[PDB]
Amino acid sequence: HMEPKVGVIYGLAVLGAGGIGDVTKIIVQILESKNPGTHLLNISGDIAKHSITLASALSKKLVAEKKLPLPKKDIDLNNKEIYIQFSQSYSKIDGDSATAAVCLAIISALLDIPLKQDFAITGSLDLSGNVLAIGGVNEKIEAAKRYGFKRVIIPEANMIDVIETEGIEIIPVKTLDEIVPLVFDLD
């Protein structure tokens, strides 16, 4: 129940064979460097690489389209060391559903814009900014509710899967464009 933070976001994962829903804290830190590279903690190289490729394109896109403010620092990601850590690893098969969160955290750190902490999110993204479908949306929604999040963001593509429930604000999104105003503190 805190105030916005830069580079910190809450994802939603389904763990173990039983597919148990749980919240996962994601923290991304970025620093200019002559020895560029990534340092991953509890996030596979594949998920990380893809998330970076996406954040690289989408960060430039939304800024150029004036949907996100110009960063104070250099928006290029190839000239820095990126630190990504997950409080716990996602399962191999559910891992891609953390991409939206990782991208938002990278974008948040890259543009030094505080990210709201009153929501959790699940979903992937494509180079166009479309929010992609994920699996286990109900288990993830329940986990968000358990930690007391006021809102949970999911792919519009998964609304059909949602088992009518209350106790939390379920917000479907179809594009990174719709997400921005929901997760960023532009004040």
Place this chain on the structure above:
Amino acid sequence: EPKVGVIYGLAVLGAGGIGDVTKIIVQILESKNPGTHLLNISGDIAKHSITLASALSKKLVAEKKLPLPKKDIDLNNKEIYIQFSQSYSKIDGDSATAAVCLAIISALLDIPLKQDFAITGSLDLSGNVLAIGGVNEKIEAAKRYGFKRVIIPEANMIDVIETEGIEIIPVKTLDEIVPLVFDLD
């Protein structure tokens, strides 16, 4: 039984309700005026699928997952015809990508596709099968249409509400799919 360039996708419309089986047909012909002709498939999905098919067709053959094509395998030098029995919603459209890609590869390499399954799922350039929405509604549609089996993204197995009368086959990659859907015999 097997047909070249024909496959069955699964769509969900409106707020909810059982899905619809969507017959997808792809035809490819060499032409000095290459381009695409679309029917009930958006330009975005068609474009993405063609790019995916161009890359994955070459990848599968180069990785011995499909036989060496006897004909020209270039998509840039031909007219591609893709038609859906019905349009998908904008938000569910991506879930037809695997199917379209498979149908394109089928027509391009002239390898018939088995006609005893329905499929749902997207794909990335690496060949990973991506999650989709409304899997339960889609599996239902498949069953009611009479399909013996339905292929879905492994990422969605957790969403599957127990059901009977149909073989549910979760897959994580295009590689796993190929032997299950192509008629190589």
